[PDB]
Amino acid sequence: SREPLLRVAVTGGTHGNEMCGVYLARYWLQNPGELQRPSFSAMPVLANPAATAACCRYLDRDLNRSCTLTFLGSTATPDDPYEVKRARELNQLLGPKGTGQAFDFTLDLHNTTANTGVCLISESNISFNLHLCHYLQRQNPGMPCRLFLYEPAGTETFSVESISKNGICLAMGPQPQGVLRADLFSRMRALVASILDFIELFNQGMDLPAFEMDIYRNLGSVDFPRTADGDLAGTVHPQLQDHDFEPLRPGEPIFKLFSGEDVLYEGDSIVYPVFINEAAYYEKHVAFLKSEKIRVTVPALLRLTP
Amino acid sequence: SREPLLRVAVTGGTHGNEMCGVYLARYWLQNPGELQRPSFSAMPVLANPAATAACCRYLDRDLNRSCTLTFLGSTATPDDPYEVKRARELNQLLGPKGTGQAFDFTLDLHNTTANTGVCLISESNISFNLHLCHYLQRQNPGMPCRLFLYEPAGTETFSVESISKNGICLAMGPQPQGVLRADLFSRMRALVASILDFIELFNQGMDLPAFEMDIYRNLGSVDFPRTADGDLAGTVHPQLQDHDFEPLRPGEPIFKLFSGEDVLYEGDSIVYPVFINEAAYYEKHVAFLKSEKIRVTVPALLRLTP
Ligand SMILES: CC(=O)N[C@@H](CS[C@@H](Cl)CCl)C(=O)O
Numbered sequence: 001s002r003e004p005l006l007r008v009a010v011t012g013g014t015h016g017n018e019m020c021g022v023y024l025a026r027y028w029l030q031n032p033g034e035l036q037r038p039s040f041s042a043m044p045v046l047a048n049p050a051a052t053a054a055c056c057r058y059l060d061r062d063l064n065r066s067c068t069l070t071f072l073g074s075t076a077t078p079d080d081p082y083e084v085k086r087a088r089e090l091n092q093l094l095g096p097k098g099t100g101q102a103f104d105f106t107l108d109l110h111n112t113t114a115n116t117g118v119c120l121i122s123e124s125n126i127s128f129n130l131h132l133c134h135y136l137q138r139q140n141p142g143m144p145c146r147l148f149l150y151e152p153a154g155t156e157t158f159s160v161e162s163i164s165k166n167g168i169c170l171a172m173g174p175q176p177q178g179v180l181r182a183d184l185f186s187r188m189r190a191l192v193a194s195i196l197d198f199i200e201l202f203n204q205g206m207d208l209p210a211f212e213m214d215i216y217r218n219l220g221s222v223d224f225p226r227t228a229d230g231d232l233a234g235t236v237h238p239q240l241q242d243h244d245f246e247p248l249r250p251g252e253p254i255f256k257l258f259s260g261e262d263v264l265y266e267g268d269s270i271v272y273p274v275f276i277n278e279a280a281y282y283e284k285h286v287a288f289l290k291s292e293k294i295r296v297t298v299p300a301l302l303r304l305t306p
Numbered sequence: 307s308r309e310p311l312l313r314v315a316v317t318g319g320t321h322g323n324e325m326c327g328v329y330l331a332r333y334w335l336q337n338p339g340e341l342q343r344p345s346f347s348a349m350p351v352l353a354n355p356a357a358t359a360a361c362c363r364y365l366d367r368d369l370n371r372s373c374t375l376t377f378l379g380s381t382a383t384p385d386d387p388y389e390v391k392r393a394r395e396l397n398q399l400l401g402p403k404g405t406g407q408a409f410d411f412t413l414d415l416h417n418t419t420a421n422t423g424v425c426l427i428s429e430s431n432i433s434f435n436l437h438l439c440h441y442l443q444r445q446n447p448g449m450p451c452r453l454f455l456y457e458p459a460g461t462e463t464f465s466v467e468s469i470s471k472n473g474i475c476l477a478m479g480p481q482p483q484g485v486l487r488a489d490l491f492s493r494m495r496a497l498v499a500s501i502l503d504f505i506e507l508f509n510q511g512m513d514l515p516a517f518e519m520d521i522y523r524n525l526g527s528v529d530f531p532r533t534a535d536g537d538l539a540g541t542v543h544p545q546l547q548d549h550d551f552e553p554l555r556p557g558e559p560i561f562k563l564f565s566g567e568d569v570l571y572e573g574d575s576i577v578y579p580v581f582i583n584e585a586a587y588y589e590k591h592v593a594f595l596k597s598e599k600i601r602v603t604v605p606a607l608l609r610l611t612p
Pocket residue numbers: 015064110111112121150159169171278280281
């Protein structure tokens with residue numbers, strides 16, 4: 001029988017310069033009304049305080065690559081990276097990751113400089129999460145709302161939502177870092193209201209019929225064309241730029257070198273590039289990500305089994 | 307009689323995270339060919355080295371607000387801001403500002419997160435500079451190429467181009483910081499080639515007939531709606547966002563508060579907002595800039611007077 005989700009968090013500011021998250025967090029800390037539902041209330045949290053204030057992605061280490069049980073379970077020192085110190089505080093608050101104490105759910109807000117529009121990033125295929133995406137699609141006709149599935153290859157998970165029993169990132173782009181677009185703030189806000197609505201109904205005992213949907217499963221990344229120096233030698237090609245989620249046949253151009261030469265996609269088959277030309281992924285050696293567009297079957301989530 | 311411009315510089319990377327400049331600079335340092343013209347060669351320079359590498363705007367102080375004669379003429383200490391140390395090195399190289407030693411001309415490259423497209427920022431109305439903009443307009447039909455006139459209210463000038471006898475910024479947006487768009491890199495590159503072409507002809511003794519053009523003269527800025535805390539209380543309104551250089555009548559909306567309320571433009575007459583929602587201007591308390599669209603007469607620049 002269905003367990004209601006009662007300890008629910010919404011984290012903004014995991015990256016200090018992704019502004020929808022940041023300003024929603026700050027706002028709700030002052031104005032928690034809109035996070036109240038009948039069966040539960042979602043705790044608003046500003047994930048990376050120091051970064052949010054310096055308005056940069058991270059101080060010492062990406063907070064969202066810092067929540068492995070190794071990191072979390074390690075022994076303090078003087079000069080642990082700030083984000084490691086902070087990760088542990090989030091473990092204290094939302095976890096401990098892996099224990100029965102952890103939150104029921106974390107909704108983690110993000111912005112991107114890629115043209116992804118609305119995208120939910122999920123680290124497993126737990127049906128709850130696909131039912132959720134699907135609820136969002138139904139509530140917003142004609143607005144795309146896509147699911148990026150990024151399972152961990154290893155066993156170690158790294159992200160802030162990985163701390164709670166379940167979780168998911170709401171990613172929205174394009175937006176420059178340090179820039180708050182009114183249209184995106186308000187659309188994030190609405191989608192968050194809707195995600196909370198969803199959880200209300202789930203808790204209320206709502207039947208969620210099995211269904212089918214297309215999703216986007218990570219195949220791994222592609223780095224920028226580089227000089228032996230490890231420097232850029234070109235950038236995302238004009239015909240790829242801004243076309244996240246659209247199909248990339250082999251033989252099509254993906255980069256343009258400074259020397260004027262087109263670079264071409266070499267691969268077995270058609271893929272779906274996602275997070276094309278994200279500011280933050282330059283250092284992570286990632287010009288974009290390769291996904292396969294599959295169609296999965298999502299089991300029903302019922303109050304009672306039949 | 308006309309003096310040729312012979313010591314000419316192109317600075318990129320004044321802000322470490324504005325990428326067209328940065329990658330053009332790095333490129334030319336390796337590939338100086340395309341900066342050679344018959345009568346002169348332009349020296350490529352990476353303006354802010356430390357910032358360019360940390361990929362941020364500035365380390366201690368905006369390099370482009372750090373070239374006043376006070377700063378330049380001040381006495382070293384241990385803990386002068388890095389950009390002040392660096393400003394002085396640029397004075398050594400391109401100046402000294404105000405002396406007969408200084409460069410003939412500095413072309414200073416910039417990117418913006420506002421939707422300005424191609425914009426030349428000039429700190430005086432020296433006809434050379436308007437003749438230049440005008441040359442750019444003629445060479446690129448249908449592509450807007452606008453002149454933002456930002457005279458110094460005081461006497462003290464602050465920018466990197468202010469060091470050379472004359473100079474001008476080439477600004478192009480929109481682009482997120484830390485993101486290099488291929489279309490913008492290459493269009494900057496072409497426009498730079500063209501600016502050098504211009505100087506070639508000027509040096510060759512070319513007659514530049516008097517003419518008339520519209521320009522955009524600064525009237526000052528408008529800050530974001532703020533909480534008494536000095537925090538944001540809203541952002542650029544959806545109908546203003548992305549509409550740089552287009553007219554703002556009074557009574558039209560300029561902000562949208564988080565509380566849902568439209569803020570309205572209050573002023574004497576129609577203005578032309580420029581650099582709407584630039585990441586970097588959040589701390590400088592500037593949501594956008596007000597300009598008046600005037601039509602000036604530009605004197606001829608002839609080889610011989612008639
Ligand atoms: C560019 C950016 O800050 N977007 C987030 C997305 S969430 C993560 Cl669970 C998987 Cl990639 C990230 O890159 O960390």
